[PDB]
Design a protein around this ligand. Structure first.
Ligand SMILES: Nc1ncnc2c1ncn2[C@@H]1O[C@H](COP(=O)(O)OP(=O)(O)OP(O)(O)=S)[C@@H](O)[C@H]1O
Ligand SMILES: Nc1ncnc2c1ncn2[C@@H]1O[C@H](COP(=O)(O)OP(=O)(O)OP(O)(O)=S)[C@@H](O)[C@H]1O
Ligand SMILES: Nc1ncnc2c1ncn2[C@@H]1O[C@H](COP(=O)(O)OP(=O)(O)OP(O)(O)=S)[C@@H](O)[C@H]1O
Ligand SMILES: [Mg+2]
Ligand SMILES: [Mg+2]
Ligand SMILES: [Mg+2]
Lengths: 497, 318, 256, 330
DNA sequence: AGGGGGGGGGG
DNA sequence: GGCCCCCCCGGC
DNA sequence: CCCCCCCCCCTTTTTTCGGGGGGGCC
């Protein structure tokens, strides 16, 4: 019914069997082996893992860059094994409420279509068994509520094979799928794994395609077979020859733009080539600002973290590394002030471009060069979380001892805590278990608890660390102290905290 | 006095692909696809007012003939394009059974797709993939980076270039001949110079002139159309002496009604895109302009601040 | 217009449509000189709906050539809801049909309502349903079957039907106890409608989900007696007898 | 309003009702008159600073096009109203796609102060403008062009409202004097124009304050002294004396002169700095770095004053900055 | 930039 | 159909 | 089974109003 010359080249030349899939052979073999031994694992209750390690996972998580052939490979492996494909995609609502009334029934139930289609067939034991394919898991948005958790629970209480397909795996939303599926990673096909297919397509479509320029096309499409096929289809409409005379124009016109990751952004921005006289004409200031804007919530942190681990090559005659570092730090402080002004009540987001220069571009322009080591992710977030937790515990302690002390939390930390340590930790190290009564009396006088004790002893830094001292305390003393604390009533300062 | 006349932008909006000027290779490719059918999924990107919406509309009209009404689904930023809309209405249109000539397909035109949310774009993927034998997708956007990578992978790329002076000039002669407008060479040159490659602005200026003064000349065009202020800002920033820059700012910017915030923003952009100046000097000037912008945003939008910024920039470039 | 099928009352058509509207979303109708046939496959690929209506149900039926129509439950249900239940309902389809015409005719108030329903393109070919040698055959009234299904669905999410010698048991062991209902063949002369009949051949023990049974029993008001055919390993056939034609549900059993 | 128009402020009492009462925008007024006289009225973008008469001009244009009952035949939306994506999608689209009610005519939409609108609404308005152009026209009034998306700017014909020229302000002042039966000295007029900076609202407010200040307006003439007393602005003579003392006299006498001048009439330091800047802008300096230092230090002092602080220290800093900058002259 | 991992060639 | 609530961009 | 090029891919979360979208109660 459908004419053979009226279909997209991607569908017309789609692989018919797994043997025609180009690239990522190892992943294909692994997936085929996993799908060919699922029954044995089920009979073993997914307990006896095999040599390949695929005998314990009842679900598969396929991931890779777009346009590599994950969906096609999954569909072909499902078809060749005789299973019945049930596909759930991003165009179907996959919220928790809808999923609870949907695929749950099919996860542990035979297919009627398979029974009524393979009834006359023989040895097709897999024709009546469902295989679930969840395509574009990353495509779930606020429109799908609680889908990730439902899928994570599905991957462990599933009675039928399940295959998940996604484009981004490092995203935090994939955290629940960390250790519940067999991870299959697909790479960008090489220029030699698709040469024969592309030459065959060119011969069939009656347009000349010079082999010597093939690689650049992939370099232009960056591992996207679908994109290069579409490029060929579009160019062949009016241009019947693809040679070195016009390869540059099409490569420039069809260049794919993908936002760089924070690590890649930091690596590129801290390179001295782009800041040279010749590099600046290629990678301009606008290009650097766009690179910053690719991820404006992480770039300044990465720059501030990784600007001390470079070997600058753009140092001014007579300038030292330390002077450039100081200038970069001053610019970073100015950018921090600008950022604080940006996120104020006025919401001056129009200053974001300025923050690009004062936080990322300018400080990097003074220490640009070659990294002296591996790029490290910013550690400021963990430090901020730890400081917030410490401040919360300090506030709790201060308001627990407010009725007895005349000071603030800052004064409590800076002045009171050492004196308190002199009474709540020191006498355990001298009198052994005979200091329990005095410590309990102090706690009662200042309305302190055991959790408050742990929080207070955890604040100290420098040569007054208490972790080793606390650990070296005999276990009998600690047990006796706990028993004494739990064997009597204590006053409470704040009620219904 | 209440019978409005159709503006020349809509009156002379091209209806065939042969009336579109500029981007010759893409226009001939579109014409060939329309003649031979089999229109693939496409994404057309470019700056405003270059003929993307017109191009897609002409392509769809020529392809579908009389079936345009029942075979074209057009959605833009002025219509609801939420995730539910994509999941229900677009799916219904794609699954619709419409008898068409053998070489034609249903067309969905999502204009201004750069404003669509990520969820709708993600949901559209399998909708285009599964129903590619009956329905095809043509997106028109201003910024290509706002479209998710999978959609670009499934679609061809058509990046429209900037309209050359010759093409705009030729279209102007054609429209003037059609309207029988008395013109002079200098007036047309001024109109094209002020248009900066925007055909719509050129048509608007050409209508406003003649509609207000009759004959087209440099003076008539310039008394209603002002020279782009970015050029004046660049001239001020490149002045050899501080006195010249101050005079330019006072005469062409401050006394003409331009606001300080606009002036500082334009200076920021111009310094961002100044190739002749060294990158380090550009960064210092950007820092100074940002300081001035922060001062202005706090309330002190005075000519004194702009003069101080110009003086500091001159000191830096000395 | 080769296809013209007239129902004296739209109520019959509405009752036919809504009986399987809540289990499927896309349906395919084949219109032939012998009547109407229809097939529907649920999204989960577990429950299959078959339907046919003979020429007796139509006061007028003309079909020069066989045709096919792809329909969606939501739009058809909305269009039917627009019309009343006491007007003649005419379905009209022309050659190369991209849409169907629904005519609501009221001959007392002289009222004509024309609706156009756009057809859908469905690739799925019809599954060849072949007469199965069902081991167990049962025929019971619709009312108590619906009652038992609804009551047992509240205790478990999947119930087991066991057919043995003069015994039909509905085990509903789950979260709430293990309540079950056991019935035996019974014949009433005064009330032939309530006649449980058993054609025991071989023991049967098949587990079926609660949601599919709940959706299927929704058609209990449509018919009077429901016929349940079970086999050793095959989908249960729930036959709903019609005045002319019938409505069949195929339900695939759960594994083990 | 309440009672009569005499109770209204002069800024609102003298609001133009027709197009011929708008002064200082002859080119724009003539262009719009020609447009509305022959049916070719395109989409308008009135860009200009405050107090130029954009709102008055558009109101007069609407009145001329439609007549007395123009309020019921136009859709006026401003920053005071909620203008979101939903509003643009529903209300504006319905207004543009629907016929008139009271009388036959085209639909007019006035989006005053559109620079305070979100980017989503501006993006949505593009197709609304380009689809109903046959029967609807759009007018957008703005003070800052950077807040408008390029797509919106491309679809509108731009008209710039310049600061009011001297002659227009004189004519309006004469009309106001005739209406209010008031007399103004020529020097007072020159001072009013100098302090006006092209804003008619300032003219009207200062004139009303001066009239209220007079003991008896019937036979009293407003002079420059009255204007200075009402506005509290420094007199040119005081500015000249302060600058002379700073430039030639020593530290102690310059400080004494500045303090005496400020305390004589309670003058503010920022106005003195502004006047000194205006005076020195015309000085034929022989060196550039002197002007650079003057501008930078005076801008720093103005920024510091804007946030408050010690006034005496700020004045001493002004004196020291001027002296140091002029030291470079040699 | 540093380290881990997959696939073609040599052994 | 209407609140109420939660998550997410924000420059050119 | 063991070793050597050639390249690809991963090393990772906090944020001040105002507006928009999309889900859940009712
Ligand atoms: N290994 C491959 N060999 C040949 N063609 C391929 C290959 N991979 C993809 N294609 C072609 O691209 C078309 C679509 O491939 P897809 O399977 O949809 O890509 P994908 O990996 O699923 O990327 P996303 O996540 O759907 S954007 C196929 O019909 C093929 O024509
Ligand atoms: N290549 C062109 N040739 C002739 N006229 C053009 C051309 N491009 C634009 N115009 C004219 O300008 C008018 C508007 O063109 P548009 O199609 O709206 O530009 P656009 O690029 O689609 O604007 P955006 O990106 O949606 S804001 C047309 O009706 C034409 O009259
Ligand atoms: N050209 C003018 N001629 C006479 N009076 C004017 C003129 N312009 C402004 N005014 C006077 O100042 C008052 C306010 O004018 P407006 O129309 O509000 O200025 P505006 O440009 O709309 O202010 P913005 O840009 O919205 S802050 C008018 O009522 C007039 O009394
Ligand atoms: Mg795919
Ligand atoms: Mg457009
Ligand atoms: Mg106004």
């Amino acid at each position: 019914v459908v004419r053979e010359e009226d279909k997209l080249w991607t569908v017309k030349y789609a692989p018919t069997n797994l043997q025609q899939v180009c690239g990522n052979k190892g992943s294909v073999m692994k997936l085929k082996n996993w799908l060919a031994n699922w029954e044995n694992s089920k009979k073993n209750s997914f307990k006896h893992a095999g040599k390949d390690g695929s005998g314990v996972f009842r679900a598969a998580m396929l991931y890779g860059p777009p346009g590599i052939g994950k969906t096609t490979a999954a569909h072909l492996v499902a078809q060749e094994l005789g299973y019945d494909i049930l596909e759930q995609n991003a165009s179907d609502v996959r919220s928790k409420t809808l999923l609870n009334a949907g695929v749950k029934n099919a996860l542990d139930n035979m297919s009627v279509v398979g029974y009524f289609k393979h009834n006359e067939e023989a040895q097709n034991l897999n024709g009546k068994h469902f295989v679930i394919i969840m395509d574009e898991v990353d495509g779930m948005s606020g429109g799908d509520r609680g889908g990730v958790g439902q899928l994570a629970q599905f991957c462990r209480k599933t009675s039928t094979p399940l295959i998940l397909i996604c484009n981004e795996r490092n995203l935090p939303k994939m955290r629940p799928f960390d250790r519940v599926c067999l991870d299959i990673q697909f790479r960008r096909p090489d220029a030699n794994s698709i040469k024969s297919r592309l030459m065959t397509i060119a011969i069939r479509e009656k347009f000349k395609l010079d082999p010597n320029v093939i690689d650049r096309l992939i370099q232009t499409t960056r591992g996207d077979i679908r994109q290069v096929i579409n490029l060929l289809s579009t160019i062949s409409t009016t241009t019947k020859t693809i040679n070195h005379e016009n390869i540059n124009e099409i490569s420039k016109a069809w260049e794919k733009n993908i936002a760089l990751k924070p690590f890649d952004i930091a690596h590129k921005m801290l390179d001295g080539q782009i800041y040279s006289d010749i590099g600046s004409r290629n990678f301009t200031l606008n290009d650097k600002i766009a690179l910053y804007f690719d991820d404006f919530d992480f770039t300044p942190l990465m720059i501030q973290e990784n600007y001390l681990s470079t070997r600058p090559s753009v140092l001014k005659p007579g300038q030292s590394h330390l002077e450039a570092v100081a200038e970069a730090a001053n610019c970073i402080s100015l950018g921090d002030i600008v950022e604080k002004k940006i996120r104020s009540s006025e919401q001056l987001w129009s200053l974001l471009p300025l923050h690009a220069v004062l936080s990322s571009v300018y400080p990097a322009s003074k220490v640009a060069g070659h990294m002296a080591g591996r790029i490290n992710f910013t550690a400021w977030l963990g430090q901020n979380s730890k400081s917030a937790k410490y401040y919360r515990l300090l506030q709790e302690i201060h308001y627990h001892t407010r009725l007895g002390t005349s000071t603030d939390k800052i004064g409590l930390r800076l002045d009171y805590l050492p004196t308190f340590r002199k009474r709540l930790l020191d006498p355990f190290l001298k009198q052994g278990a005979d200091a329990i009564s005095s410590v309990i009396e102090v706690m009662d006088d200042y309305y302190l608890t055991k959790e408050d004790w742990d929080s207070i002893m955890e604040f100290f830094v420098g040569p007054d660390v208490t972790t080793a001292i606390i650990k070296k305390i005999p276990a009998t003393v600690k047990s006796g102290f706990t028993r004494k604390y739990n064997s009597m009533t204590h006053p409470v300062a704040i009620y219904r905290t | 006095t209440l019978s409005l006349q159709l503006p020349w932008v809509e009156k002379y909006r091209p209806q065939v692909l042969s009336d579109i000027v500029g981007n010759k290779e893409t226009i001939d490719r579109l014409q060939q696809i329309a003649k031979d059918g089999n229109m693939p999924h496409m994404i057309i990107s470019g700056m405003p007012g270059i003929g993307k919406t017109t191009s897609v509309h002409c392509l769809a009209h020529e392809l579908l003939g009389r079936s345009y009404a029942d075979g074209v689904l057009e959605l833009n930023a002025s219509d609801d394009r939420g995730i539910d809309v994509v999941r229900n209405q677009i799916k219904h249109f794609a699954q619709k059974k419409l008898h068409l000539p053998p070489g034609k397909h249903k067309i969905v035109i999502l204009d201004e797709a750069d404003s669509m949310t990520a969820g709708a774009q993600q949901a559209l993927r399998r909708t285009m993939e599964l129903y590619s034998n009956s329905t095809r997708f043509a997106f028109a956007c201003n910024q290509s980076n706002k479209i998710i990578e999978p959609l670009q992978s499934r679609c061809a790329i058509l990046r429209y270039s900037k309209l050359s002076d010759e093409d705009v000039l030729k279209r102007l002669l054609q429209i003037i001949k059609l309207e029988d407008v008395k013109y002079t060479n200098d007036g047309l040159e001024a109109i094209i110079f002020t248009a900066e490659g925007d055909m719509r602005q050129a048509i608007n200026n050409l209508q406003s002139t003649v509609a207000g003064h009759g004959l087209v000349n440099a003076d008539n065009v310039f008394k209603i159309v002002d020279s782009p202020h970015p050029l004046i800002v660049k001239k001020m920033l490149l002045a050899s002496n501080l006195e010249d820059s101050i005079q330019i700012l006072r005469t062409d910017l401050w006394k003409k009604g331009y606001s300080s915030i606009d002036i500082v923003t334009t200076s920021f952009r111009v310094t961002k895109n100044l190739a002749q100046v060294k990158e380090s000097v550009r960064l210092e000037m950007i820092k100074e302009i940002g300081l001035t912008h922060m001062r202005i945003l706090e309330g002190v939008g005075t000519y004194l601040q702009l003069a101080s910024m110009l003086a500091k920039i001159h000191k830096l470039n000395n | 217009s080769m296809l013209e099928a007239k129902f004296e009352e739209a109520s019959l058509f509405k009752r036919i449509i809504d009986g399987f509207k809540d289990c499927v979303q896309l349906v395919n109708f084949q219109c032939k000189e012998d009547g109407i046939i229809a097939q529907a496959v649920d999204d989960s690929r577990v429950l299959l709906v078959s339907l046919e209506i003979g020429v007796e149900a139509f006061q007028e039926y003309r079909c020069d050539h066989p045709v096919t129509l792809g329909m969606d439950l939501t739009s058809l249900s909305k269009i039917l809801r627009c019309g009343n239940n006491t007007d003649t309902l005419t379905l009209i389809a022309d050659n190369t049909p991209d849409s169907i015409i629904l005519l609501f005719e009221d001959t007392k108030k002289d009222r004509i309502a024309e609706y156009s329903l756009k057809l859908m393109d469905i690739d799925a070919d019809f599954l060849k349903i072949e007469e199965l040698q069902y081991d167990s055959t049962l025929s019971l009234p619709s009312s108590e079957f619906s009652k038992i299904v609804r009551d047992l669905s509240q205790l478990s999410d999947s119930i087991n039907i066991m057919i043995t010698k003069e015994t039909i048991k509905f085990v509903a062991d789950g979260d709430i106890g293990s309540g079950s209902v056991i019935i035996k063949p019974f014949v009433d002369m005064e009330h032939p409608e309530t006649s449980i009949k058993l054609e025991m051949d071989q023991p049967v023990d098949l587990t079926f989900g609660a949601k599919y049974l709940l959706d299927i029993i929704k058609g209990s008001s449509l018919s009077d007696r429901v016929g349940i055919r079970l086999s050793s390993e095959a989908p249960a056939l729930f036959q709903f007898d019609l005045k002319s034609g019938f409505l069949q549900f195929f339900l695939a059993p759960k594994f083990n | 309003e309440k009672r009569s128009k005499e109770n209204l402020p002069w800024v609102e009492k003298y609001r133009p009702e027709t197009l011929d009462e708008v002064y200082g925008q002859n080119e724009v007024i003539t262009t719009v008159r020609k447009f509305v006289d022959e049916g070719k009225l395109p989409h308008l973008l009135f860009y200009g600073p405050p107090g130029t008469g954009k709102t008055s001009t558009i109101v007069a244009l609407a009145r001329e096009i439609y007549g007395k009952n123009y309020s019921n035949m136009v859709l006026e939306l401003n920053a005071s109203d909620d203008r979101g994506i939903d509003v643009v999608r529903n209300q504006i689209k319905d207004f543009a796609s629907t016929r008139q009610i009271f009388s036959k005519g085209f639909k007019l939409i006035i989006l005053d102060e559109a620079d305070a609108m979100t980017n989503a609404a501006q993006n949505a308005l593009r197709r609304v403008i380009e689809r109903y152009t046959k029967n609807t026209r759009f007018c957008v009034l703005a003070n800052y062009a950077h807040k408008l998306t390029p797509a919106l700017l491309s679809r509108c014909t731009r008209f710039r409202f310049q600061p009011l020229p001297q002659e227009a302000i004189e004519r309006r002042i004469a009309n106001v004097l005739v209406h209010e039966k008031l007399k103004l000295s020529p020097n007072a007029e020159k001072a009013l124009i100098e302090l006006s900076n092209g804003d008619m609202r300032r003219v009207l407010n200062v004139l009303q304050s001066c009239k209220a200040t007079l003991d008896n307006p019937d036979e009293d003439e407003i002079s420059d002294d009255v204007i200075y007393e009402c506005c509290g602005a420094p007199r040119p003579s005081d500015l000249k004396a302060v600058l002379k003392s700073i430039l030639e006299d020593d530290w102690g006498t310059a400080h004494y002169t500045l303090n005496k001048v400020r305390s004589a009439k309670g003058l503010a330091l920022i106005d003195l700095i502004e006047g000194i800047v205006k005076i020195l802008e015309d000085y034929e300096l022989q060196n550039e770095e002197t002007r650079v230092h003057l501008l930078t230090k005076l801008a720093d002092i103005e920024y510091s004053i804007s946030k408050g602080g010690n006034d005496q220290i700020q004045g001493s800093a002004v004196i020291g900055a001027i002296k140091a900058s002029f030291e470079n002259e040699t």
